[PDB]
């Protein structure tokens with residue numbers, strides 16, 4: 042109920058498991074975007090060398 | 091200015107009823123080639139029976 | 140500009156320009172190093188003779204083949220072969236001409252990596268492409284689908300191709316081709332007493348194999364006929380002028396293609412490899428494959444091989460179904476001819492490997508861009 | 511009277527005395543015939559080596575497997591296998607000992623007819639029994655119910671059994687197991703330049719597969735790790751003294767169990783076979799099969815197969831109930847252990863198949879007696 046009031050969504054919808062799935066997929070996209078930007082920087086450095 | 095393949099297609103379109111004649115050609119030659127193969131083996135099956 | 144086709148075959152390199160029907164520079168892939176002691180002063184004599192020059196002066200040379208079973212062994216020798224075919228035979232600058240290469244299936248990938256590295260660093264090209272030889276042999280026939288038995292000088296491989304797509308899992312390889320037939324012919328000429336031990340004598344035995352050998356239609360009857368009467372005996376004149384006569388060795392030598400147990404290989408013949416290649420495919424696409432056997436390779440020049448191929452496959456096949464062996468007369472150069480066909484299209488221009496693609500992707504885009 | 515348990519699997523025959531924990535005689539099921547010429551007269555040059563002798567002297571032997579895809583194809587070879595496992599390994603008279611045997615699901619009936627006729631006419635026994643391998647594996651797991659994925663050398667079959675009732679319609683069979691993994695490992699080792707074409711080399715590649723291969727927990731991460739760092743490369747010593755080193759082939763080879771499109775099969779992995787077996791059951795008994803995923807057969811010996819299998823089923827099944835994988839350490843011999851459990855039971859005296867039953871009802875009472 043605190044997380045439902047925190048994200049400005051009504052508590053009648055699934056505000057517990059959907060927020061966990063959305064946030065888990067967002068943290069995996071965070072780590073994946075970090076990895077791909079590191080790969081892009083490393084491949085640009087290799088192409089420059 | 092067209093491709094030579096397009097020259098071939100436009101030469102193909104300048105022929106009255108070309109596709110039916112191609113179908114006539116392939117059915118005559120293919121059915122004749124099938125008739126050479128099928129009937130002596132069918133006579134062999136009849137002789138075996 | 141005008142593209143080049145350089146079939147870097149295991150025994151003979153066939154190079155020429157695109158748009159043409161005859162390969163301009165056909166020369167064997169050998170490196171001839173001198174072994175005896177020179178006594179002339181005046182220089183002139185090289186330390187390595189490459190190509191037809193090594194063939195002409197072969198009586199004082201050790202001949203090394205750089206390619207063994209479709210695998211480039213000595214890269215320096217193959218670099219010399221590439222340098223000779225670019226600068227002496229065809230006489231073109233490599234950095235202003237597209238160049239199509241050929242490669243055998245199921246090769247080690249590092250061989251492709253090193254060929255990509257040499258063709259993009261040493262003889263750096265504006266573009267190149269590496270493609271499967273059986274595909275180009277099928278493209279020479281003017282058809283889109285079919286099976287190609289390509290029997291070169293190191294590798295005999297079966298590739299079935301459906302709608303321009305070569306099926307990868309059903310492709311098989313057999314390390315038995317013209318060099319092994321030459322070695323077996325060298326082995327069996329000692330029965331009549333004709334000894335051949337040098338590398339120069341291998342070219343003479345190869346010429347005997349090219350000019351006099353032929354595939355028997357029925358092997359046992361040809362045994363019985365050659366052992367019965369001396370009708371199949373044929374005489375050959377050596378470069379020193381001696382005349383030999385060979386009988387059953389005309390057709391004991393190509394029978395290793397249909398019976399690999401003569402030289403100790405456990406694996407089955409090329410007809411069984413063809414049949415099991417086709418049974419590795421799906422059933423519904425079998426209808427194109429028995430009717431479109433397109434043989435290729437220099438080993439397939441023996442003038443009884445199409446009827447023996449049809450006989451062995453029709454023995455193997457279900458009887459309800461057509462067997463057709465399309466053996467064109469120019470199927471030695473069908474790799475090169477199909478290379479000229481594929482290199483002379485505007486649709487191929489987007490398929491090239493530029494130098495820029497090599498620079499971003501290393502020498503490893505050839506495993507990805509080229510199938 | 512001690513019974514005999516003898517699993518005549520596709521891969522290795524596992525035999526021993528009943529009431530015991532371990533099979534005394536484990537040996538591969540090969541018949542080796544010499545392909546070369548004998549010159550050394552005497553010293554018992556026997557024309558067909560069977561079992562461990564064929565394994566030891568395998569460098570001059572063409573090896574044949576009598577059981578191919580769980581089906582006894584060659585029968586004289588299988589008779590030689592039975593003769594060696596009775597007379598040479600166990601050294602017991604068949605006429606004074608019961609002999610338990612095993613069989614694959616959805617077998618042909620005439621196969622059972624022929625095995626019964628050999629076990630009652632040639633090798634006369636007082637009694638014998640034919641059982642399904644999955645049923646005995648479930649018995650050695652100590653549970654009456656559960657689903658068994660048995661993956662041998664030719665057959666990977668899924669069998670769910672509820673309370674001793676083996677459901678016949680829900681049994682399915684996928685022809686992808688250890689010999690196919692060995693053939694694929696032969697195919698992919700040629701990328702590294704190692705050639706294995708003979709049947710003698712199949713045992714070496716099989717030993718490589720047994721010693722070094724493992725199931726990846728995530729395939730794409732193992733691709734990323736293998737392409738990035740060469741930490742997972744492992745070296746192996748060949749019998750001639752040469753040392754190879756293999757990289758991703760430790761886990762690309764068992765990944766055919768989850769992706770049959772590598773060797774070109776349209777069917778999905780063993781997880782989808784298990785799941786589609788589960789929907790063929792009643793919805794009441796699906797819950798028990800999820801917690802009772804039993805494995806048997808040596809193709810499940812790879813030390814990453816349980817966690818990956820649980821991941822694949824948990825991805826496939828709904829996550830509302832519990833998923834559990836039953837993978838005992840001795841599940842290689844769990845077919846034999848379940849046979850030893852079933853043989854020494856007081857009830858099992860009345861389900862024996864006597865010679866009087868054989869004489870009255872032909873070699874056909876095994877159909878109406880067993881499941």
Ligand SMILES: Nc1ncnc2c1ncn2[C@@H]1O[C@H](COP(=O)(O)OP(=O)(O)O)[C@@H](O)[C@H]1O
Nearest residue numbers: 148149150151291292317348349436437438440
């Ligand atoms: N007219 C011929 N008759 C028999 N064999 C031939 C003939 N011409 C070439 N060959 C054999 O084919 C080999 C060359 O085959 P080729 O098509 O060049 O294969 P690759 O391209 O793989 O080297 C030669 O070594 C020779 O033994």
Ligand SMILES: Nc1ncnc2c1ncn2[C@@H]1O[C@H](COP(=O)(O)OP(=O)(O)O)[C@@H](O)[C@H]1O
Nearest residue numbers: 519520521522662663688719720807808809811
């Ligand atoms: N330690 C191991 N690791 C991986 N695979 C193995 C191992 N031991 C055996 N195998 C494979 O599993 C099979 C074991 O045979 P098994 O399942 O007992 O009988 P069969 O397969 O003949 O029906 C062998 O063919 C072998 O290839």
Ligand SMILES: [Mg+2]
Nearest residue numbers: 148291292436
């Ligand atoms: Mg060739």
Ligand SMILES: [Mg+2]
Nearest residue numbers: 519520521662
């Ligand atoms: Mg088994």
